[PDB]
Write a protein that binds this ligand. Structure first.
Ligand SMILES: Nc1ncnc2c1ncn2[C@@H]1O[C@H](COP(=O)(O)OP(=O)(O)OP(=O)(O)O)[C@@H](O)[C@H]1O
Ligand SMILES: Nc1ncnc2c1ncn2[C@@H]1O[C@H](COP(=O)(O)OP(=O)(O)OP(=O)(O)O)[C@@H](O)[C@H]1O
Ligand SMILES: N[C@@H](CCCCNC(=O)OCc1ccccc1Br)C(=O)O
Ligand SMILES: N[C@@H](CCCCNC(=O)OCc1ccccc1Br)C(=O)O
Ligand SMILES: [Mg+2]
Ligand SMILES: [Mg+2]
Ligand SMILES: [Mg+2]
Ligand SMILES: [Mg+2]
Ligand SMILES: [Mg+2]
Ligand SMILES: [Mg+2]
Lengths: 267, 267
């Protein structure tokens, strides 16, 4: 008995990283599907009985506590933003990131990153708060993607940043190290570059990019009224969850009607 | 010395409910503005030094703990949804709620409510979880609005719901009473009606609608594969914050670059 592509795809939906089941051992599809359906129902019943917290919600809460306790102000800024912020961030009207923007109406878009709203907060808060200014945000961001195992069109970003004193590469690396040590995630730092910010310190878990981080100043600062040293980093929460839970596909971690805490809801 | 409309508007931005300052006492605008700027800087410095949590984030966390502890599963579902869900909810292509939808691309929109995603979860979870099924979600929703003192175009909804046993008007009212007692908010229940769900139990704080709640079944259920009794209610978090903090305008409570925890960021 050989399994079709449709049958293999169904069993993959129902399989979880903790299982050790051979799909092509010769056991018939009916028995493999029944076994995995029972395991997944049991898993969902246990979540309902004992935890009840959503992985993305819980991780946002965990990250929020970490940064609040370290002196960063928690921001919740608009997800629907002016389309003018795109050109103003140096996302040239050519393509790459520009073709990835979801437009809303004629003058708005869904934010593809948190940085512009955070830059506006740094500028405004510097007129009232003592040095250094430390803020962060966690929330939804949106990009059109070719959709692989590591990209979502609707994902969740953390961006923390600081402006004023202490905005050095060593302090940025120290914050990233404390943060990922808190989550229990091994990493290395590798140099990369991007169109918006220039040179980045990319935080890698193996071949998976968890974050890009930047040490300012950069030429873009003038356009946003930023006139002091700064440091910042952006992380994808679903990528963090993919590492934490050993998911093969980031879709297990996404906002979704198709998975609850990585368990298929098609049972 | 009389104040212009622009000067009055500026002082209103800087005024907070706890102040007792007459804007038109005859004191010159320069002194009223300087006094309010100092108070607001002091307020923001105190938040930065001692709390650091965003009002909307904190309230979402408080509400999440309440519902998780009462047996409801925490959901985080897509904000960008299929445009087909609009017609399928009975939002007729005429207008009213239909003209309020933000469209994205050609086949998507920003969700104007949480209900359709929650209906899909109830249906799917009923195939694996024991009766009754209890779930909730908190997150952003979007509607085009004439924009008054009680409406935002980008707001935050809580919707909790239950399907199976216990889906009575008395139990729905009991949950609403426990919830608003937990937040310390007085209310009454008044009947109303809406195009989507029919008769609603509206939760009122004075003339302010905090929620619409529904006791099913309703004719819409068949289109969503819902085939059991159910109850549910939707609340706006920014309206809850407006009551809690005595804000004159709901914009003080919104996701915004213009206010932080109700304090102007234009200082
Ligand atoms: N489409 C996406 N889905 C999930 N997470 C994402 C996506 N795009 C970015 N992120 C996360 O946000 C972080 C910061 O965004 P950044 O602009 O640096 O991404 P990126 O360099 O375009 O990532 P990649 O090179 O993997 O596309 C990334 O390191 C990643 O963790
Ligand atoms: N544009 C908005 N801004 C802020 N909160 C809102 C908005 N629309 C709805 N809500 C909140 O969501 C809850 C449930 O949504 P519902 O569809 O019942 O609103 P609604 O009846 O259209 O409210 P209203 O009659 O005030 O426009 C409302 O009771 C309200 O608390
Ligand atoms: N990995 C993230 C890294 C974001 C870092 C930016 N965070 C910030 O604090 O703003 C500083 C800023 C100043 C001036 C002009 C523009 C800007 Br932006 C990303 O590429 O999405
Ligand atoms: N005040 C909120 C009240 C929402 C209650 C709905 N919540 C739910 O659980 O779904 C049940 C459901 C079943 C079948 C077909 C459609 C649907 Br929807 C609002 O009007 O936004
Ligand atoms: Mg990319
Ligand atoms: Mg990259
Ligand atoms: Mg990057
Ligand atoms: Mg309305
Ligand atoms: Mg109403
Ligand atoms: Mg209503």
């Amino acid at each position: 008995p050989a399994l079709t592509k449709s049958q293999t795809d169904r069993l993959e939906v129902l399989l979880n990283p903790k299982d050790e089941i051979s799909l092509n051992s010769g056991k018939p599809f009916r028995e493999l599907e029944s076994e995995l359906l029972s395991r997944r129902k049991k898993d969902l019943q246990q979540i309902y009985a004992e935890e009840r917290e959503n992985y993305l919600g819980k991780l946002e809460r965990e990250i929020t506590r970490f940064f609040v306790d370290r002196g960063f102000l928690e921001i919740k800024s608009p997800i629907l933003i002016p389309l003018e912020y795109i050109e103003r961030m140096g996302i040239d009207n050519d393509t790459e990131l520009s073709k990835q923007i979801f437009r809303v109406d004629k003058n708005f878009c869904l934010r593809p990153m948190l940085a512009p709203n955070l830059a506006n907060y740094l500028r405004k808060l510097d007129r009232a708060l003592p040095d250094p200014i430390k803020i962060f945000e966690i929330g939804p961001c949106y990009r059109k993607e070719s959709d692989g195992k590591e990209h979502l069109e609707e994902f969740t970003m953390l961006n923390f940043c600081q402006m004023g004193s202490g905005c050095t590469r060593e302090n940025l690396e120290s914050i990233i190290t404390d943060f990922l040590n808190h989550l229990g995630i091994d990493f290395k730092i590798v140099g990369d570059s991007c169109m918006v910010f220039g040179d980045t310190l990319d935080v890698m878990h193996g071949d998976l990019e968890l974050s890009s981080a930047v040490v300012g100043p950069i030429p873009l600062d003038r356009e946003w009224g930023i006139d002091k040293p700064w440091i910042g980093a952006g992380f994808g929460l679903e990528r963090l969850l993919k590492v934490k839970h050993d998911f093969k596909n980031i879709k297990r971690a996404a906002r979704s009607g198709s998975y609850y805490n990585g368990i298929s809801t098609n049972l």
